Amino acid sequence: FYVREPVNAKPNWLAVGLSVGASVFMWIYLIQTHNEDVLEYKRRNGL
Amino acid sequence: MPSTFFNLTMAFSLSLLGTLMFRSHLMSTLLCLEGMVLSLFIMTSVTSLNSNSMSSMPIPITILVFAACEAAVGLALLVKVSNTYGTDYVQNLNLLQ
Amino acid sequence: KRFFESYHEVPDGTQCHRKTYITTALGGICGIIGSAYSVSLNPADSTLEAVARVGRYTFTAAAIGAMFGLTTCVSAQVREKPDDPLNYFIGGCAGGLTLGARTHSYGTAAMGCVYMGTAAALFKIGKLEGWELFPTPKV
Amino acid sequence: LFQLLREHWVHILVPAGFVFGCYLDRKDDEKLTAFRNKSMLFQRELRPNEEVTWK
Amino acid sequence: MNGRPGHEPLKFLPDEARSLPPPKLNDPRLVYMGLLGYCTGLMDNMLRMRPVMRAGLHRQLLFVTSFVFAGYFYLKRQNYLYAVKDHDMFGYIKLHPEDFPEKEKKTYAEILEPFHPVR
Amino acid sequence: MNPITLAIIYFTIFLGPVITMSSTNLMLMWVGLEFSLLAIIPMLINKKNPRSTEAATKYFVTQATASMIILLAIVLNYKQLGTWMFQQQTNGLILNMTLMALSMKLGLAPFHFWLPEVTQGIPLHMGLILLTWQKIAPLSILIQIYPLLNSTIILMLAITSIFMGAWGGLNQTQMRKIMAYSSIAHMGWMLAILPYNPSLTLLNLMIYIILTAPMFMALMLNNSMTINSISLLWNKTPAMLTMISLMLLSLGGLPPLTGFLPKWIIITELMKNNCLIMATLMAMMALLNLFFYTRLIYSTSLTMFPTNNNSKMMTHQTKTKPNLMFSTLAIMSTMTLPLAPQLI
Amino acid sequence: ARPEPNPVIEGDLKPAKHGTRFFFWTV
Amino acid sequence: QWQEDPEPEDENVYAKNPDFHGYDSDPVVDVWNMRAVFFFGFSIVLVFGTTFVAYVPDYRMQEWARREAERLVKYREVNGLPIMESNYFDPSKIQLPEDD
Amino acid sequence: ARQWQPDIEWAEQFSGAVMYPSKETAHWKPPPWNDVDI
Amino acid sequence: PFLDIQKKLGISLDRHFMFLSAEQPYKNAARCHAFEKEWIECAHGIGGTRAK
Amino acid sequence: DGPEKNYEKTLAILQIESEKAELRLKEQEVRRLMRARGDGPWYQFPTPEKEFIDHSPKATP
Amino acid sequence: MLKIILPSLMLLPLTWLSSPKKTWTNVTSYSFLISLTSLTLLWQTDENYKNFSNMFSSDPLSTPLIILTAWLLPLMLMASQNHLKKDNNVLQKLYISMLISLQILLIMTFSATELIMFYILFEATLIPTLIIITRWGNQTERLNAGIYFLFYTLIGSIPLLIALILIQNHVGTLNLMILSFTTHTLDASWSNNLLWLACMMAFLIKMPLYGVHLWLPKAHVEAPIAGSMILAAILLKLGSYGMIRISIILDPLTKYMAYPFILLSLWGMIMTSSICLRQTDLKSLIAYSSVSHMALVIASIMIQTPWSFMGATMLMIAHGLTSSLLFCLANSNYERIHSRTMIMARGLQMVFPLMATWWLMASLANLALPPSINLMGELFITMSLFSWSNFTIILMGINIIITGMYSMYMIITTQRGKLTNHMINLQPSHTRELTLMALHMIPLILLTTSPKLITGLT
Ligand SMILES: CCCCCCCCCCCCCCCCCC(=O)OC[C@H](COP(=O)(O)OCCN)OC(=O)CCCCCCCCCCCCCCCCC
Ligand SMILES: CCCCCCCCCCCCCCCCCC(=O)OC[C@H](COP(=O)(O)OCCN)OC(=O)CCCCCCCCCCCCCCCCC
C-alpha cells in the first residue's frame, strides 16, 4: 500500500469503457467504410 | 486630394520615424503611436469620402475603436512600468538582455 | 543603379578605373550600412567616437572594395585572360588582405584571403555560367 | 507451443521475421510481373500444361 | 491546388474520390501508422513510469486503433489529392499539345556521343 | 485569473488568429491581428515579475507599430484600387511594407531581436503560445498574398534569419532563449518557400509546431529554463531523455527523423525553381543549428551532469504525469519520415 | 466582350499513375 | 569535495568460476553462451556457409564463358573466321556522321 | 576505468548567461532562477 | 481565404463589402461603379495570371 | 527459380522507374507553363466575387 | 532482400523482450544465422545483377559488403560483452539495439537502388554511431570526438543532398539502374567542376582523405571497441561504396578533376603510413594505418580502371576484416593493461601465447604477405596506378616499405621483448576474446581461397 494512496489503484472504469468502446466503434465504422467503399468504387467504375 | 494624401502619408512616416527612434519617456512613444492612428483615420475617411464609398465608412471608425483599446492596453503597461520603476524611462527596460 | 551595373558591361580586365571606382563604392556603401548597424546597436560613447567608427568601417570597406577591384582587373590585365575565376580569387585574395591589415591581424588575413577570394571567384563563375540569384518563381 | 517466459515467445520472433520476409519478397515478384515472359532473350512459348514461365 | 474548378471550399475528400480504389487496410502505410501508434502508447507508459508493455492495455488499443483509423481516412484523401494531380496534369499536356511535343530520339546508331578514353 | 477573464482572454487569443484566417476583407484580417495583440499581453504578465512588465511592454510596442504599418498598407491599397484587399495591380511598395510589418509580427529576421528578449521573462506555457499559436495568424495573411509579395525581399529575409538564428543559438545557454533562436531560423525556411510552395510553407510550420510543442512541455515538465537545469533530467525523469534527444536533433535537419522532410522538400522546391545559390547557403548554416542542438544533447543525454542531493527528495514524491499529447506528437515528430509522400 | 473562360480538364479520376512519385517510395 | 564513488576495481572473474569463458559471471550462462556461439558461429556458418558458397554454380558466368569460348574458338577456327574480329558492333549498323 | 562522466568543472561552462563570453559579455551573470529580480 | 469557414457555412460576413461596386447604402452608387463592374465581371473565371 | 525471373523483374522495375521519371519532368514543364500562362486549373489566383455586384437602379447613371 | 533486413529488425524486439541474463545469447546466436541468410545473395549464376524489388538491389559490389555488415553484428556483440557488462540491464539492451540498427541501416544503404535512399540511410548511420562513441566512450574527449565525427560528415553531406536533388531535376530519377543506362555526361563547365566535387566530397570525407582524415584518429581513439570495429570495417567503406555508384554519372570530369585528390591520397598514404611509425597509442596507429590503406582506395576509385575497382573491392572487404581484428586485439590488451600506451605491455607472447599468433596473422594481413586477398588488392591498385603514371610506384613504393615497418613494430614492441615487470597481473585469455578473433581471421583465410566473390563490379 502507500501512506498516500495512489489515485489509480482501482481502474477508472469509465476510462476503460470509452477507450475500449470507442475503439470498437472505430473499427465497425472503418471496416464498414472499406467494404462500402469497395462497392462504390466497383459500381462507380466498370466493376 | 493627391497633395493632401501625400502630406497625411508623410505625417504617418514622420510619426513612423518617431515611434522607431525612442528617447526617454515611453508615454511619448505611445503618444506618437496615436499620431499614426489619427493619420490613418484621416486618410481612410478622406478617400472613402471622395470615392463616395459609403459602404466603407464603417471602417474609419472600426479603426479608431480598435486603436483606442490598443492604446488602453499600451497605457496600462506604461502605468505598470512606473509602478515597478516609477520613472517610465525606456532606459530601464533592459533586464531581459 | 545604371552605374553599378556598368561594372559588368565592359569586359573584365578592361577599364580598370571604372571597375575600381565601382567596387570601391559598393564596399563603402556596405561600410556605411555596416557602421550604421554597428552604431545603432552597440552604440558609442560620444557622437564623435561613433562618427569615427563610421569612418573606420567605411574606409576599411572601401579599401577592400578597391583592392578587390584593382587586383582582379589588373590580374586579368597582366594575365591577359579576361574570363577566369582565378583573376577574381587573386582579387578576393587581396581584398581579404586589406581587411586583415585594417584589423591588424595576420590570421584574419588568412581566413580573409581564402574565404573572401573564394567568394569572389564564385561570383565570376556565377556570371560566367549565368547562375540566377533571388530568382522569380517560375516553378 | 509458445511456451512462455521467453521459452518460445521470443525465440520465434526473429525466425518469424524471416518467413514474413520471404512472404514479401515472393509477393514483390507478383507485382513486378510484367514482361512476365515478354522479355526478348527469354520469350519461350508456353509449354503444354504450364501456367507461366517464372512464378 | 485551389482555384481549380469545382473545388470544395472546406470539404475533406470530395465524393469524386469515391472513384479511386480504397486503401487496403493492410497497406504498409496504415500498418506503419499502427506501429507508430503502438509506440506512442508504449512511450506514454514509459514517460509516466508505468510497466511499459503490461499497462494500459486498453490505451494500447486506443492508440493503435486511433492512429490506424486516422490513416485510412487520411490516406484515402492524400490518395485523391495525388489523383487529382494527374487528372490535372495529364489533361493539360493534351489541351495544350504543342507545348509538350513528343520528342523522337535517334537510335544510338545515329547519335554520336563523344568518347572520353580513360587510359 | 477569475476564470471568466481567463475565458474571455483565451477566446480572444483564439478568435484572433481565426478571424484573420477566415476573412478576406483585409480590414477584418487586421483586427484579427489586433485582437491577438490585445489578448496575449495580459497572459504575458501573469507572474507580474519585474522582467515580465519589460517583456510585455516590448512585445506590445513592437506588435503595435507593425499593426499600424499593416493598416497603412490596407489604407493605401484602398486608394490605389477601391478594393479592400491586395490585387495583381497592387503597387510593389504597398506589398513590401506589408511583408516587412508581418515579418515584424513574426520577428522573422531583421526584427528578430524582440523575439528572444520577449520569450525570456514570460512563463514557458505562454512562451509556447507566443511562438506557435501567435505565429499562425501573420503567416495566414502572407499565404493569401503568396503570388504578390516580391521574391528578392523574402529570400534575403529568409537567409538573414537562418544566419542570425543559428548564431544566436550557439551563445545562448538560456533554454527558452534557445527555443526562440530556432523559431527565427525555422520561420526563415517557411518564408523562403512562401513565394514558391505555400503548401510547403504550411508543412514547415506544422512540423515546427509538432516539434516545438513537445519540446517546451518537456522543458516545463521539470520547468528547467537552463541547460544545466535540463541536464539533471536523468535524475528528475529518465524516460524523456530518449525522446528529448531525438526531438532536438529532429528540430535540426538530420535525415532519419521527421525534421529532414521540411528542409528536404523546401530545398527540392527551391532547386526546382532554380535557387541553388540561396538554397545551398541556407542548408549549410542550417547545419550550425544542429551544433547547438547537439551541445544540449551532450549536456542532457549523452553525458550525465552532476546533480544536487535534494534531487533525491524530488524523485521521492510522485512525478507529474506529462500530457497525453506530449507522447503522441513526440512519436509523430521524429518517426514519420516513412509517411513523407502523403504529408506533402 | 468578356475574356473566354479557360478550358476545363475533363474526365474521371483514375488512381494516380505509379502513385506518389516521391523519391524512392514504391508506394 | 563533491561526493562521488571510490574507483571500482575490476574483478578477477577467473578467481571464482575458474572455468570462465569470458561471456558472463555466473557459470551456466557462460557455458550456454559459448556452447551456442562456437556452434552458431563456427559450426554452421563457417562450415555450412562455406559449403553453400563453394557450391554456388558458375558464379558470374565464368564457368559458362570457358565453354562458349571453346565452341566459338571451335567454330571460328574451323570455318576460318577471325577468332576475335576487330570491330564488334558491325560497321554496317553504324551510321557515321556523313559529312565529318 | 570509468567512462569519464562530466565533473563539476565541465558543468561550470554551461552556466553564465552566454556560452561564449567575450569582453564586457561576462558582465552578464545568469538570470535569477525564480524569474524575479531583486 | 486560408480557411474558408465562410463559404462553407454559407455566411457572408466579410464579402458583401469589399469593392466599390458592392451594395452601397440607399443604393447610392459610388464613383466608378461602372468600371469596377466591367473590370471584375471580366476577371471572373479567368484567374489572376490572366486577369493581368 | 532462375535467370528468367530477375531479368524480367529488372525490366519491369526499369519501366516503372522510366515512366515515373518522364512524368516527373513533364510535371515541371506543365507547372512552368500554367504559372506564367495562368491558362490551366493550377495557379488560378482569385479576383473579387462577381456575385456581390449590385445590379440595380441606384438613382444614378 | 528483406530477410537480411526484416529478420534483422526483429532482433530489436528480441533484445528488449528477452531475459536480462539470456539477452546476449539470443541476440548473438540469431544474427549468426542472419548472416547465413545473407550468404544466399552470393548465389549469382549470371551477370544480370539481382534487383530484388523497386527500392532494394544487390550487385556484385554491394553483396560482398552486406554479408560483412551482417557478419560483424555478431562479432560486435561478442566484443562488447565485457565492457558493457558492468551496465544496468537497460543500458545494455540499448547498446545491443544500437549495434543492431547499424547493420539494419548499413545493410539497406549498401543494398539501396535510389541514391538519396543511400543519402538518408547514409547519414542516419551517424546517429547510432555517435551514440555508441559518445555515450559509452571511456575518455573525457569523446564529446569532442563525437562533434568532429558529426560535423565533418554533415558539412560534406548537405552538398551531396543539393547535388542529388540537382541531378534528379537534370535527369529525372535518382535510380542507380536508370542513371547507368541513361546519358548523363557532364560538360566540363566551371559549374560541373563543382557538381563533381559536391557528389564526391561527402564520400571522400568518411573515406578519410589526407586533407579531412583528422576525424577518424580522434573518433576511434575514445570510441568503444564495437564502435571502432564498425567505423573501420563498415562505416568508412560507406564512402567507397558511394564513390563507385555515384561516378557512373559525372563520367567526363573525373578524367581531369581527380588529379587533386589522387595526389592528396598518394602523398597522404606516405605521411599517414609514416606517423604510424612513431605514435604511442596503439589504437592511434591502427587508425592511421586505416587512413593510409584507405588512401589507396580513393586512388583507385578515381583512376577508374577495371583493375583498380577490383583491387578496391578486394582491399576494402579484406582491410575491413583485418582492421577490426587489429582493433579487437588492441582492446583485449587495453582491458587488462587499462592503458592504450604501446610502450607498456611488452612481451605478452610470453604470457598470452595464442593471442600473439592472432596478432602475428593480423599484422601479416596488415602488411602485404602474398597468399592473402590483402596483397592481391594492393597488387592491383598498384598496377593501375603504375598505368596512370609509371612514377606512381615511387610513392606507392615508399608506403609498402613503411607499411612493413609499422605493422611489425606493433608486433615487436607489443608482443615480444621482455615481459613488463608487474603491471596488474594479466589474467589469462577468455575464449570469447580468442573466438572474436578467430571469427575475424577464419573468414579471411576462407575468402583468400576463392577471391572471385569479393572481386568488384569491373
Ligand atoms: C534510424 C535509427 C536511428 C537510431 C535509433 C537508435 C538510437 C535512437 C536515439 C537514442 C538517443 C538517446 C541515447 C541515450 C539514451 C539514454 C537512455 C537511458 O539512459 O535509459 C534510461 C531510460 C529510462 O529508463 P526506464 O525505461 O524508466 O527504466 C530504467 C530506469 N532507470 O530508458 C531508455 O531511455 C532506454 C530505452 C528507450 C526506449 C527504447 C529505445 C531503444 C532504441 C530503439 C532503436 C530503434 C532503431 C530502429 C532502426 C530502424 C532503421 C530503419
Ligand atoms: C563473402 C563476402 C565477404 C564476407 C566476409 C565475412 C563472411 C563471414 C560469413 C561467411 C563465411 C564463409 C563465406 C566466405 C568464405 C567462402 C569460402 C569459399 O568460397 O571457398 C571456395 C573454395 C572453392 O574454390 P573456387 O574458388 O570455387 O575454385 C576456383 C576455380 N578456379 O572452396 C574451398 O576450397 C574451401 C576450402 C576450405 C579451407 C581453405 C583453406 C585454404 C587456405 C589458403 C590460404 C592459406 C594462407 C592464407 C594466408 C592469409 C594471411 C592473412
PDB file of C-alpha atoms in Angstrom, chain E residues 24-110:
ATOM      1  CA  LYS E  24      -6.241  -1.639 -48.429  1.00  0.00           C
ATOM      2  CA  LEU E  25      -6.474  -1.728 -44.666  1.00  0.00           C
ATOM      3  CA  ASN E  26      -3.168  -3.580 -44.510  1.00  0.00           C
ATOM      4  CA  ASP E  27      -1.446  -1.065 -46.758  1.00  0.00           C
ATOM      5  CA  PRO E  28       2.035  -0.909 -45.427  1.00  0.00           C
ATOM      6  CA  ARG E  29       1.444   2.727 -44.555  1.00  0.00           C
ATOM      7  CA  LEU E  30      -1.638   2.168 -42.425  1.00  0.00           C
ATOM      8  CA  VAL E  31       0.241  -0.688 -40.793  1.00  0.00           C
ATOM      9  CA  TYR E  32       3.060   1.751 -40.112  1.00  0.00           C
ATOM     10  CA  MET E  33       0.676   4.205 -38.610  1.00  0.00           C
ATOM     11  CA  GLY E  34      -0.363   1.329 -36.425  1.00  0.00           C
ATOM     12  CA  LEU E  35       3.147   0.708 -35.226  1.00  0.00           C
ATOM     13  CA  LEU E  36       3.713   4.423 -34.983  1.00  0.00           C
ATOM     14  CA  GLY E  37       0.739   4.349 -32.683  1.00  0.00           C
ATOM     15  CA  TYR E  38       1.673   1.386 -30.586  1.00  0.00           C
ATOM     16  CA  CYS E  39       4.924   3.157 -29.924  1.00  0.00           C
ATOM     17  CA  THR E  40       3.166   6.319 -28.863  1.00  0.00           C
ATOM     18  CA  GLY E  41       1.307   4.227 -26.388  1.00  0.00           C
ATOM     19  CA  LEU E  42       4.356   2.452 -25.137  1.00  0.00           C
ATOM     20  CA  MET E  43       6.184   5.737 -24.926  1.00  0.00           C
ATOM     21  CA  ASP E  44       3.452   7.255 -22.859  1.00  0.00           C
ATOM     22  CA  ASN E  45       3.574   4.424 -20.410  1.00  0.00           C
ATOM     23  CA  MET E  46       7.279   4.960 -20.135  1.00  0.00           C
ATOM     24  CA  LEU E  47       7.207   8.704 -19.549  1.00  0.00           C
ATOM     25  CA  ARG E  48       4.531   8.205 -16.929  1.00  0.00           C
ATOM     26  CA  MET E  49       6.578   5.442 -15.304  1.00  0.00           C
ATOM     27  CA  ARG E  50       4.236   2.506 -15.772  1.00  0.00           C
ATOM     28  CA  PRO E  51       5.097  -1.047 -16.681  1.00  0.00           C
ATOM     29  CA  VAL E  52       5.927  -0.310 -20.307  1.00  0.00           C
ATOM     30  CA  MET E  53       4.105  -3.101 -22.113  1.00  0.00           C
ATOM     31  CA  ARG E  54       1.902  -4.595 -19.415  1.00  0.00           C
ATOM     32  CA  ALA E  55      -0.076  -1.450 -18.694  1.00  0.00           C
ATOM     33  CA  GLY E  56      -2.951   0.440 -20.203  1.00  0.00           C
ATOM     34  CA  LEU E  57      -3.716  -2.483 -22.443  1.00  0.00           C
ATOM     35  CA  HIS E  58      -6.881  -0.571 -23.102  1.00  0.00           C
ATOM     36  CA  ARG E  59      -4.921   2.509 -24.073  1.00  0.00           C
ATOM     37  CA  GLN E  60      -2.565   0.479 -26.130  1.00  0.00           C
ATOM     38  CA  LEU E  61      -5.627  -0.352 -28.184  1.00  0.00           C
ATOM     39  CA  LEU E  62      -6.980   3.155 -28.338  1.00  0.00           C
ATOM     40  CA  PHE E  63      -3.664   4.234 -29.741  1.00  0.00           C
ATOM     41  CA  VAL E  64      -3.089   1.501 -32.296  1.00  0.00           C
ATOM     42  CA  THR E  65      -6.707   1.941 -33.288  1.00  0.00           C
ATOM     43  CA  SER E  66      -6.856   5.713 -33.338  1.00  0.00           C
ATOM     44  CA  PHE E  67      -3.800   6.180 -35.447  1.00  0.00           C
ATOM     45  CA  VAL E  68      -4.936   3.487 -37.869  1.00  0.00           C
ATOM     46  CA  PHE E  69      -8.444   4.888 -38.108  1.00  0.00           C
ATOM     47  CA  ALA E  70      -6.935   8.214 -38.912  1.00  0.00           C
ATOM     48  CA  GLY E  71      -4.792   6.691 -41.566  1.00  0.00           C
ATOM     49  CA  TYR E  72      -7.417   5.081 -43.716  1.00  0.00           C
ATOM     50  CA  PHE E  73      -9.314   8.307 -43.910  1.00  0.00           C
ATOM     51  CA  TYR E  74      -6.268  10.432 -44.447  1.00  0.00           C
ATOM     52  CA  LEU E  75      -4.576   8.224 -46.950  1.00  0.00           C
ATOM     53  CA  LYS E  76      -7.930   7.993 -48.638  1.00  0.00           C
ATOM     54  CA  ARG E  77      -7.611  11.706 -49.202  1.00  0.00           C
ATOM     55  CA  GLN E  78      -3.956  12.137 -49.882  1.00  0.00           C
ATOM     56  CA  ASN E  79      -4.527   9.439 -52.443  1.00  0.00           C
ATOM     57  CA  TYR E  80      -7.215  11.592 -54.004  1.00  0.00           C
ATOM     58  CA  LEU E  81      -5.104  14.666 -53.998  1.00  0.00           C
ATOM     59  CA  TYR E  82      -2.407  12.878 -55.913  1.00  0.00           C
ATOM     60  CA  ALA E  83      -5.002  11.503 -58.283  1.00  0.00           C
ATOM     61  CA  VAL E  84      -6.335  14.951 -58.946  1.00  0.00           C
ATOM     62  CA  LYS E  85      -2.830  15.988 -59.745  1.00  0.00           C
ATOM     63  CA  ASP E  86      -2.643  13.596 -62.634  1.00  0.00           C
ATOM     64  CA  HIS E  87      -6.119  14.390 -63.901  1.00  0.00           C
ATOM     65  CA  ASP E  88      -4.987  17.940 -63.915  1.00  0.00           C
ATOM     66  CA  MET E  89      -1.517  17.311 -65.259  1.00  0.00           C
ATOM     67  CA  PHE E  90      -2.326  14.852 -67.981  1.00  0.00           C
ATOM     68  CA  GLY E  91      -5.201  16.941 -69.195  1.00  0.00           C
ATOM     69  CA  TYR E  92      -3.080  19.985 -69.696  1.00  0.00           C
ATOM     70  CA  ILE E  93      -0.492  18.047 -71.642  1.00  0.00           C
ATOM     71  CA  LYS E  94      -3.216  17.448 -74.194  1.00  0.00           C
ATOM     72  CA  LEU E  95      -5.277  20.635 -74.140  1.00  0.00           C
ATOM     73  CA  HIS E  96      -2.012  22.407 -74.788  1.00  0.00           C
ATOM     74  CA  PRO E  97      -0.430  19.780 -77.004  1.00  0.00           C
ATOM     75  CA  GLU E  98       2.083  21.833 -78.956  1.00  0.00           C
ATOM     76  CA  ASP E  99       3.893  22.778 -75.790  1.00  0.00           C
ATOM     77  CA  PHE E 100       4.609  19.212 -74.886  1.00  0.00           C
ATOM     78  CA  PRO E 101       5.508  17.643 -78.202  1.00  0.00           C
ATOM     79  CA  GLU E 102       6.674  14.052 -78.307  1.00  0.00           C
ATOM     80  CA  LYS E 103      10.372  14.068 -78.966  1.00  0.00           C
ATOM     81  CA  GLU E 104      11.825  11.319 -81.109  1.00  0.00           C
ATOM     82  CA  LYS E 105      15.321  10.376 -80.057  1.00  0.00           C
ATOM     83  CA  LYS E 106      17.567   8.691 -82.590  1.00  0.00           C
ATOM     84  CA  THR E 107      18.715   5.125 -82.296  1.00  0.00           C
ATOM     85  CA  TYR E 108      22.244   5.307 -80.902  1.00  0.00           C
ATOM     86  CA  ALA E 109      23.393   4.179 -84.362  1.00  0.00           C
ATOM     87  CA  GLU E 110      22.598   7.757 -85.495  1.00  0.00           C
TER      88      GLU E 110
END
